[PDB]
Amino acid sequence: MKYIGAHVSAAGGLANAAIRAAEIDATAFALFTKNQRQWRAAPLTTQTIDEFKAACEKYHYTSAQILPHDSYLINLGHPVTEALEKSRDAFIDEMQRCEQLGLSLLNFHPGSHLMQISEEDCLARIAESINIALDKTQGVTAVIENTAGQGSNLGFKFEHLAAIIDGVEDKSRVGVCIDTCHAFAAGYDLRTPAECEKTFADFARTVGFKYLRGMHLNDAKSTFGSRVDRHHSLGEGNIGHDAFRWIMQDDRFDGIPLILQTINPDIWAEEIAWLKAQQ
Ligand SMILES: [Zn+2]
Ligand SMILES: [Zn+2]
Ligand SMILES: [Zn+2]
Predict the structure, then answer these.
(1) CB–CB of 146/107 below 8 Å?
(2) Residue 246 is part of a domain; what is its CATH number?
(3) Closest ligand to residue 109's CA
(4) Which residues are close to ligand 1, an ion, with C-beta < 5 A?
(5) 212-217 and 257-260 beta bridge pairing
(6) Environment class of residue 269 by beta-carbon count within 10 Å: exposed (0-12), middle (13-18) or buried (19+)?
(7) What is d(CA 117, CA 113) in angstroms, rounded to the nearest whole number?
(8) If DSSP codes are grouped into helix, strand and coil, which group holds residue 232?
(9) Ligand nearest to the CA of 227
(10) Which residues bind Zn(2+) 2?
């Protein structure tokens, strides 16, 4: 089985994310659990938590179908240690909100070296950040998202993901999410079925499908290897529709949230329906 949805809005409360997912016939969804703009969000209230759980139950979203995204302001590889510590505190808080909400996955971009430390040192800082969060929480898997590699962002090579995982002690609670736009922008081609297989064999040799915990299904406005992150609606960008059909027909992508972050929410229900029909 595949679980297919979108990163929907949590405006008016977290439970509305589940409602919005059901209104586009999603079988998965992503959301932010707080505003992306504060190192301290107010505590989740017992009512927010219960409304969210009640809506997930009403619309049949189990923990395995939901892929929250952390704030884009967190940098778990920050070269400045006081900033690193603020990002680690924020990340622990995000993981704890997932605990409270009954969520079992948390997707995040790994971090950025800001030209102040080496790639290896940054990746090690990121692995330690994950270890710290996993020591302070239970039941939530840290899902590392690949990136386009814009600026000093890491995680654009599959080897970066593997290097982080190698440094994580509790391998049972780390995994990865592959965003197709980010992969393409980083230089992993997806424009033909043969190129898709080549890219995913690379992923298999370097990371392995045992760590795959989510996908983000995005076409790309940016160009191949551009290292720019600009999504597009399915079929309208530089990747094209074939990659998405290929993914939908491959059983290695079963049982995990497959999340659109495409740029026109007015057509999400149609994109979800098209993806389901490609199976
Ligand atoms: Zn992301
Ligand atoms: Zn993404
Ligand atoms: Zn992106």
Answers:
(1) no
(2) 3.20.20.150
(3) 1
(4) 145
(5) parallel
(6) middle
(7) 6
(8) strand
(9) 3
(10) 145, 179, 216, 261
